[PDB]
Amino acid sequence: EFITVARPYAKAAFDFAVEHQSVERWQDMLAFAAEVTKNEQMAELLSGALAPETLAESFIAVAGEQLDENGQNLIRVMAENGRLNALPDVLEQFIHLRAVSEATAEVDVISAAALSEQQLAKISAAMEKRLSRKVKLNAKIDKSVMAGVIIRAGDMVIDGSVRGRLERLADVL
Amino acid sequence: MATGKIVQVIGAVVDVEFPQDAVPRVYDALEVQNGNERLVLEVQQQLGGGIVRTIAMGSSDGLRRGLDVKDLEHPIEVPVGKATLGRIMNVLGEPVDMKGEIGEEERWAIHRAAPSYEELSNSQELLETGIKVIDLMAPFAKGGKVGLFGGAGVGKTVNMMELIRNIAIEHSGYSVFAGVGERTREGNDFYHEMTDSNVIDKVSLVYGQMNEPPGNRLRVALTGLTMAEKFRDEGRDVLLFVDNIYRYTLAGTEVSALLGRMPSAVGYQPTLAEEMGVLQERITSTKTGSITSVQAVYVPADDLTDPSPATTFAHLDATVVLSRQIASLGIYPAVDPLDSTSRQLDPLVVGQEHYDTARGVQSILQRYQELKDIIAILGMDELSEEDKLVVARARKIQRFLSQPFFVAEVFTGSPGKYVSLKDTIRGFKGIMEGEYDHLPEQAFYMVGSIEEAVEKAKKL
Amino acid sequence: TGKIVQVIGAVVDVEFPQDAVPRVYDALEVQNGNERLVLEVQQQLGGGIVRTIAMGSSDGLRRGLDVKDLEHPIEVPVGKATLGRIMNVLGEPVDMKGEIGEEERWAIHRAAPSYEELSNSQELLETGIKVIDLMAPFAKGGKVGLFGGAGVGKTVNMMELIRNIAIEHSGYSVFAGVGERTREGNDFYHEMTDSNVIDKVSLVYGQMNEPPGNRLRVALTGLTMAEKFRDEGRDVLLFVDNIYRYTLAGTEVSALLGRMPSAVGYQPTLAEEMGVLQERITSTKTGSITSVQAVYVPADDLTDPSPATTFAHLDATVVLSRQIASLGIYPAVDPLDSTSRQLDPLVVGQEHYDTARGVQSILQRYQELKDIIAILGMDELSEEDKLVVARARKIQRFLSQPFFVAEVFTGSPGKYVSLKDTIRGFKGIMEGEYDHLPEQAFYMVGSIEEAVEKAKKL
Amino acid sequence: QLNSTEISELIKQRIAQFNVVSEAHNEGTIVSVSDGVIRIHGLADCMQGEMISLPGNRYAIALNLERDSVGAVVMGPYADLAEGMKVKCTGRILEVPVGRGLLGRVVNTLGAPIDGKGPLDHDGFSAVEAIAPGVIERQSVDQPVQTGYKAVDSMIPIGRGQRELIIGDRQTGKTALAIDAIINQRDSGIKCIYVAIGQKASTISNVVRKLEEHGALANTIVVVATASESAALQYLAPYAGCAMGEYFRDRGEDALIIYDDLSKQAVAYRQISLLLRRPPGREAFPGDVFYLHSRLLERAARVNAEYVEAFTKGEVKGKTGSLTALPIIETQAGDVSAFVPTNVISITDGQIFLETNLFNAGIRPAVNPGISVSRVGGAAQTKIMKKLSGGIRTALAQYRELAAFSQFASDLDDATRKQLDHGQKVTELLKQKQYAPMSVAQQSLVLFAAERGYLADVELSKIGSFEAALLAYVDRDHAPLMQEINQTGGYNDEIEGKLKGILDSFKATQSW
Numbered sequence A: 001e002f003i004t005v006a007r008p009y010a011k012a013a014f015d016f017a018v019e020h021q022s023v024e025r026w027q028d029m030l031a032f033a034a035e036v037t038k039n040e041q042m043a044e045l046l047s048g049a050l051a052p053e054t055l056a057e058s059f060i061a062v063a064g065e066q067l068d069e070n071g072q073n074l075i076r077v078m079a080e081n082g083r084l085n086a087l088p089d090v091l092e093q094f095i096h097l098r099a100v101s102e103a104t105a106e107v108d109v110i111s112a113a114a115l116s117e118q119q120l121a122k123i124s125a126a127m128e129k130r131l132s133r134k135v136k137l138n139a140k141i142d143k144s145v146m147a148g149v150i151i152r153a154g155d156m157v158i159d160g161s162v163r164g165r166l167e168r169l170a171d172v173l
Numbered sequence B: 001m002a003t004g005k006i007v008q009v010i011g012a013v014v015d016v017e018f019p020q021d022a023v024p025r026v027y028d029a030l031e032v033q034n035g036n037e038r039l040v041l042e043v044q045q046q047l048g049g050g051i052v053r054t055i056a057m058g059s060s061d062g063l064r065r066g067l068d069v070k071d072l073e074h075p076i077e078v079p080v081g082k083a084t085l086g087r088i089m090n091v092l093g094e095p096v097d098m099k100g101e102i103g104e105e106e107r108w109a110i111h112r113a114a115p116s117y118e119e120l121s122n123s124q125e126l127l128e129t130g131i132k133v134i135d136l137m138a139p140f141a142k143g144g145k146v147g148l149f150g151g152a153g154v155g156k157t158v159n160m161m162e163l164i165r166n167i168a169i170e171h172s173g174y175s176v177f178a179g180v181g182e183r184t185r186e187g188n189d190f191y192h193e194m195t196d197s198n199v200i201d202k203v204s205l206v207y208g209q210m211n212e213p214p215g216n217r218l219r220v221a222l223t224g225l226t227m228a229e230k231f232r233d234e235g236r237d238v239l240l241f242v243d244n245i246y247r248y249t250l251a252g253t254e255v256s257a258l259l260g261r262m263p264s265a266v267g268y269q270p271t272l273a274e275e276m277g278v279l280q281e282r283i284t285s286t287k288t289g290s291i292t293s294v295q296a297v298y299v300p301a302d303d304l305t306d307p308s309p310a311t312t313f314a315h316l317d318a319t320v321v322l323s324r325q326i327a328s329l330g331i332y333p334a335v336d337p338l339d340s341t342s343r344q345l346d347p348l349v350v351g352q353e354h355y356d357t358a359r360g361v362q363s364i365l366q367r368y369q370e371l372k373d374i375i376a377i378l379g380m381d382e383l384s385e386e387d388k389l390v391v392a393r394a395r396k397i398q399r400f401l402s403q404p405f406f407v408a409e410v411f412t413g414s415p416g417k418y419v420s421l422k423d424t425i426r427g428f429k430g431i432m433e434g435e436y437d438h439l440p441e442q443a444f445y446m447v448g449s450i451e452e453a454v455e456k457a458k459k460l
Numbered sequence C: 001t002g003k004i005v006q007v008i009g010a011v012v013d014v015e016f017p018q019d020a021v022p023r024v025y026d027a028l029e030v031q032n033g034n035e036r037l038v039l040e041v042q043q044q045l046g047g048g049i050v051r052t053i054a055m056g057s058s059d060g061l062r063r064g065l066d067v068k069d070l071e072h073p074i075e076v077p078v079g080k081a082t083l084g085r086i087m088n089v090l091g092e093p094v095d096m097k098g099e100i101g102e103e104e105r106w107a108i109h110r111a112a113p114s115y116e117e118l119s120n121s122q123e124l125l126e127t128g129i130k131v132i133d134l135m136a137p138f139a140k141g142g143k144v145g146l147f148g149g150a151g152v153g154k155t156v157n158m159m160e161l162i163r164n165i166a167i168e169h170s171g172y173s174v175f176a177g178v179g180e181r182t183r184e185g186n187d188f189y190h191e192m193t194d195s196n197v198i199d200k201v202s203l204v205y206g207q208m209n210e211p212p213g214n215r216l217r218v219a220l221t222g223l224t225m226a227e228k229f230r231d232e233g234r235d236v237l238l239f240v241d242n243i244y245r246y247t248l249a250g251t252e253v254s255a256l257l258g259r260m261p262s263a264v265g266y267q268p269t270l271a272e273e274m275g276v277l278q279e280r281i282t283s284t285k286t287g288s289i290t291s292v293q294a295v296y297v298p299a300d301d302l303t304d305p306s307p308a309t310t311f312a313h314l315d316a317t318v319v320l321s322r323q324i325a326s327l328g329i330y331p332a333v334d335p336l337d338s339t340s341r342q343l344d345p346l347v348v349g350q351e352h353y354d355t356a357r358g359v360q361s362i363l364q365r366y367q368e369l370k371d372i373i374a375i376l377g378m379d380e381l382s383e384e385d386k387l388v389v390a391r392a393r394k395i396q397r398f399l400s401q402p403f404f405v406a407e408v409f410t411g412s413p414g415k416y417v418s419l420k421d422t423i424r425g426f427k428g429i430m431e432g433e434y435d436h437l438p439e440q441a442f443y444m445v446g447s448i449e450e451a452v453e454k455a456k457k458l
Numbered sequence D: 001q002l003n004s005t006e007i008s009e010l011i012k013q014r015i016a017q018f019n020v021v022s023e024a025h026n027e028g029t030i031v032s033v034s035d036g037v038i039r040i041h042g043l044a045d046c047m048q049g050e051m052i053s054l055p056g057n058r059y060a061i062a063l064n065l066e067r068d069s070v071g072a073v074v075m076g077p078y079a080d081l082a083e084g085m086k087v088k089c090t091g092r093i094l095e096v097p098v099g100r101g102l103l104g105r106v107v108n109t110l111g112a113p114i115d116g117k118g119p120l121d122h123d124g125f126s127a128v129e130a131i132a133p134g135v136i137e138r139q140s141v142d143q144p145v146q147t148g149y150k151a152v153d154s155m156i157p158i159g160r161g162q163r164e165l166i167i168g169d170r171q172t173g174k175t176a177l178a179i180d181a182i183i184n185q186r187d188s189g190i191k192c193i194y195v196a197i198g199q200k201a202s203t204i205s206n207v208v209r210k211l212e213e214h215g216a217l218a219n220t221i222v223v224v225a226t227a228s229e230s231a232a233l234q235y236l237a238p239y240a241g242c243a244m245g246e247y248f249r250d251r252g253e254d255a256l257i258i259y260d261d262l263s264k265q266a267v268a269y270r271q272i273s274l275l276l277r278r279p280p281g282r283e284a285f286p287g288d289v290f291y292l293h294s295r296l297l298e299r300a301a302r303v304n305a306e307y308v309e310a311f312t313k314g315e316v317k318g319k320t321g322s323l324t325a326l327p328i329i330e331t332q333a334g335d336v337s338a339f340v341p342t343n344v345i346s347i348t349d350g351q352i353f354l355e356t357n358l359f360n361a362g363i364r365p366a367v368n369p370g371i372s373v374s375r376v377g378g379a380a381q382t383k384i385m386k387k388l389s390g391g392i393r394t395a396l397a398q399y400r401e402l403a404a405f406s407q408f409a410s411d412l413d414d415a416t417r418k419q420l421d422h423g424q425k426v427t428e429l430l431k432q433k434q435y436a437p438m439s440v441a442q443q444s445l446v447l448f449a450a451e452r453g454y455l456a457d458v459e460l461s462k463i464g465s466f467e468a469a470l471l472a473y474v475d476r477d478h479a480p481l482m483q484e485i486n487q488t489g490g491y492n493d494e495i496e497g498k499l500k501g502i503l504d505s506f507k508a509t510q511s512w
């Protein structure tokens, strides 16, 4: 897993994209690179011991979607360090650094049944106060919980479900 | 043209990267200009793509990253043949005696495969060394291997000097001396002794001195073996002297540690017994020629059990054990007659005469060892009239095994002696059978042949 | 201005802006909840990260806390104001009295005095202990070390040396408790306070309850006060309660600092971490430090890397052994291993030297006979080897002595034996003038007259 | 999966332009600081062993040249350093002041004066790391170097150009013997060098004070690397000392170098290796710790007159040079099998074994003769000493063979009891007080007294007073014979007759 070795590359790519006000182009470029990493044949080549400046060039060849200077340079650095497989995580941490920079968040709302669209309005209004960030919502439905709602925002959760109330009563006794 | 570049230098270990077509094979030799001076690297491993890890055969200091490296497309190969007699060479076959270019006609790679079991011939021609005790107690055939075991200061190196001199002067045989991990003082002593004794023009010398990287000290044994094999293929009977196996094994331990291999029984490389078998199995008597070998082997801390001497034993055909106690009493060669042994000491090969004489001597000394402590506690005047005779004859036998060497003349000024096997058996049999009960003990000390004991007694 | 990014046991990793990264040994600070935690940085990793050791309980630290960079190393009160008061490794007062009225504060990391400034002294120091100042006399301004396993006497001996040297000495004194019992620290503090000598002793205590950083730096905190008193021109006593804990605390933290283990799991920098401390505890032309150090040896193994590297840094080495204590012979000094740089004919005179070497020769000759005695019994000795053995056993007894600080154990009153009075007794025992007395006449007595007087009662 | 100094802004630089211009291969920037090792980024033209120059006036030695990093060790206090500091590669290797003017000075491993007596008067600089003279440039060692100890000079001779290991457990006289070997040269024409590794400074000050009391300090160089100095300055100190001894060797003079506890250079090098993440060997020592000591000790050589003429460009003709080494090793619990002793016992030409049982039993210097060896042997002795030591060797060998019965000696026959009580007396004869070195005339006189049976009737308790009385007697009555032996070492029927007469008349008329 590359959660840790991806942090420096995502941070460098984001700090560069900001200087040039191209964050969106960089995100799409990384999203394409992290896809070419997943192809059946390319994932074979990435594992075999090729010399870095050969693997990097064969990888560059498969992408005209990369602005020839700054995206290809990132590919060449990651290739020199032997980390092209880390791109699918560079993408996630780039999206994270962006969401932080623009003060945005994305809340999952899980319920036994879909909400009335006034509840959703008040939920978003409330969370945009719990968090400084402008919040999207993704409503989701799960009939294990049977009343109330779960609000999950990052690693924080608010366990408003009655299922939670029951399991939390059982353990008082 | 030069097609590689250095990418790491960590001590003696250098990494070089080539385009993935031109990757050198293992054991290939590379070359680079370390300043105004050339340096050659031996490939040890092909790892990853294009990169190759090597051991420098020389001073690693002064290497930059990114130097151009040129790959010779052959292993380290050395000059061979008659041109090398009387010269000194390092592991790369360059002269280090300042007499200039070698004059080679042919070069051989030092890495080659051992003779098949199909090509060997068993032979039982006993070498005659001219040393009383080694000839009597530890006979060895052509194509055999002999190990001189002992601590420090017992006489391995001068015993090998004397064997070289005797074989070169009495039998005019060619010899090769591989100074694995040589002490430069001893190498200079050896050179001057061989030129003074006038044998140098029948010995070719290879020196990997101690002050050199591990790879030199490891591959010098193979350079010497390659010269010996070139002489063998001419149909000769060469004799190969390895000045210490123990330093061959330490050089292997160093090399293995540098490459980062996982260590084994007492810090020894994992490949110990395979390096030893690669060395020792090229020394054999083929149908075309023969390589005999004498090998000094230091036993550290007297234990005989740590992996180095423990693994050498599997290959030797005879063992001569030297003790410092015997040496301190002043009876050089200092060979212990009761612990030294040979696989060839049986009547079918040495004949009942020699076998009987050797077992007789061992029996007399083994009985004297019994009697020593009765002599200590009860005094000698209490011994039987037969036991006092056994004591006198054991003491005379014990004196008569000592001998003055031609190369020890620098130590004591006494002139050296060469003693045939016939005179050895005749003398020891005469002693054991009472023919000399009338001579004093000291008439046998450092005497040489038995007639010289009667010539000496008159002077006493 | 920095963030915590890892917390592994006692070591904390902090991330700073690229232009503000602290220097090595600078001290940081964190608000560990309702607390203030001081971190001392050990390594500058790359990229603005810095790796630190916590001077306090590491529990409760979250990631992402905010740490403040104090731009100076750890600094302790020092000088005359710190006298008679107990202090933390951080120089904070630990007795319930008020603040320390110090005028000046010193950083605890310092360079050793130059080779040019050192001084050497032949002036012998006298102690009430027969065996010490016979076999291993030591001199004013020099180093002494007591080596022993667990529970053989290296604290009682140090309290006796305190009693015999420190009360009868005018200058100030410093006692550093490094990773030993807090019970003993309280006992010592109250003994001093109840005998009204506490106003001449400065106490630093970093006992075994504390986390590794305190045990790691408390010895330097004590050396800094001893060095201040030295440089003022005075002459000082420095007692260290167990210097082994100072390297053990380094071994506990080494692997977390990401360093490869050495011979027996010890840090790779053992000899340097030990030398950088013991090279600044020395006397100089401007003033002198006399020091006694207890040195624990683990598993009674005198060849363990830590005692082995410590031996070289001491003038007089006193080696205590369990096989002597189990005989009830206290102090359990092993006279065939105790030694001193001062034992020379030129320094202690010919009579003292000659008696010491005679004692060693007899005791070694007795060691050589212990196997034949074990197998074949004592009746197989030559008529004079029996004499050697009897005198050796008498000498073994006579090296025992009662201590004023051991009355709590044996009830017998302490004895103070002058040097003149002990070389005479040993000359007597060796020359044969006391063969008539039984062995037990010598056990736990002072001068030799007490032995001839004790024989009358059996 | 762990990073290798791929960090945010360094990566961003490459994002901006991957093929960064070749701005300067001459310089780089510190990226890490810890335990005296710094990692440097850049320095494309660094060479292994090269001196790198830091802020202040400080240097580092480039030891690891890797893919995008140089690992270098700071030669001094490192805590001042900080990430981001700029650094330059000098084209140089480490050099040290060298010359005749160093005699009588105390210097640290960089040759800076540390005794406070003012600036050095060196004759130029010499590289610390140098190759030893080849096989063809040596000459056989056949000149004695006198320690003044009856135990050593008779039975374990040291010759000019030898390498004699002193090995034993702690506190057995390893330093006392080596420093008596230096004091004795005070008027021998041999320059001395004493390099102290990892010792505490107040011990070096004390041995310098003893060298100053006796006449020895004006003839010796002291090189100091105290316990608090960084590992690099302890590991390089022996090479600094050897480079100063080679100044004399290469110019037709004789020198003697005493490396104090090389077992503490091996530990400094182990620390440096383990901090650079190099593969640990046995006891965690690095792989090439044999190659560390081998290329140090192979510099102690005797060089023939032709090499000296070629080196000094004709200024010195017909003189051989020589450098003698006496490395010291410490063995924990008599374990000569450990990784460091088992290498240095294999490199050297001899071994002096100091044993703590002899040291306690009163035998000082506590040499063990049945296990010590000198491979040069009699070639390094004056012929009188060569003649007279032959009987001492066997007198002690038979005694070692009979020793077991010493505890049953009442039972023995008188024929062996004479051997046993002669061995005890010759063993009592080799004891010797410290700082009392004997001239060859005195050693030969006493060994003659012992060999020819004159001690056959002296009681064992009195051997020392016999020896002292004999030397005092000889110093007044027969001063010319001593002055002859000391000057020539010869041995003739005449010398033997005169010695026989001295012993007869002394044992007749004097008393002890």
Ligand SMILES: Nc1ncnc2c1ncn2[C@@H]1O[C@H](COP(=O)(O)OP(=O)(O)OP(=O)(O)O)[C@@H](O)[C@H]1O
Pocket (backbone or CB within 6 Å): C312, C340, C341, C343, C344, D169, D170, D171, D172, D173, D174, D175, D176, D177, D364, D365, D432, D433, D434
């Ligand atoms: N020939 C001698 N006669 C009497 N005493 C001696 C003799 N040689 C040394 N000593 C004493 O032995 C003690 C230890 O000697 P020394 O310090 O030389 O040993 P060492 O091996 O260097 O110890 P360390 O390992 O601590 O350096 C010294 O105090 C010295 O006085």
Ligand SMILES: Nc1ncnc2c1ncn2[C@@H]1O[C@H](COP(=O)(O)OP(=O)(O)O)[C@@H](O)[C@H]1O
Pocket (backbone or CB within 6 Å): B151, B152, B153, B154, B155, B156, B157, B158, B159, B332, B333, B405, B408, B411, B412, D374, D375, D376, D377, D378
């Ligand atoms: N036969 C001999 N005659 C005289 N001296 C000898 C003899 N054998 C060995 N020696 C002495 O032993 C010393 C070392 O012997 P050497 O063979 O080098 O020992 P090692 O086997 O350890 O190399 C030499 O200096 C020499 O003086």
Ligand SMILES: Nc1ncnc2c1ncn2[C@@H]1O[C@H](COP(=O)(O)OP(=O)(O)O)[C@@H](O)[C@H]1O
Pocket (backbone or CB within 6 Å): C149, C150, C151, C152, C153, C154, C155, C156, C157, C330, C331, C401, C402, C403, C406, C409, C410
């Ligand atoms: N001089 C002495 N007389 C009597 N008993 C003693 C003496 N010295 C030590 N002991 C005994 O040894 C025990 C060990 O205590 P201590 O000296 O504190 O060991 P440690 O050195 O580990 O602290 C003491 O509690 C006491 O029982």
Ligand SMILES: [Mg+2]
Pocket (backbone or CB within 6 Å): B156, B157, B243, B296
């Ligand atoms: Mg040899």
Ligand SMILES: [Mg+2]
Pocket (backbone or CB within 6 Å): C154, C155, C180
């Ligand atoms: Mg205690």
Ligand SMILES: [Mg+2]
Pocket (backbone or CB within 6 Å): D174, D175, D176
């Ligand atoms: Mg010493």
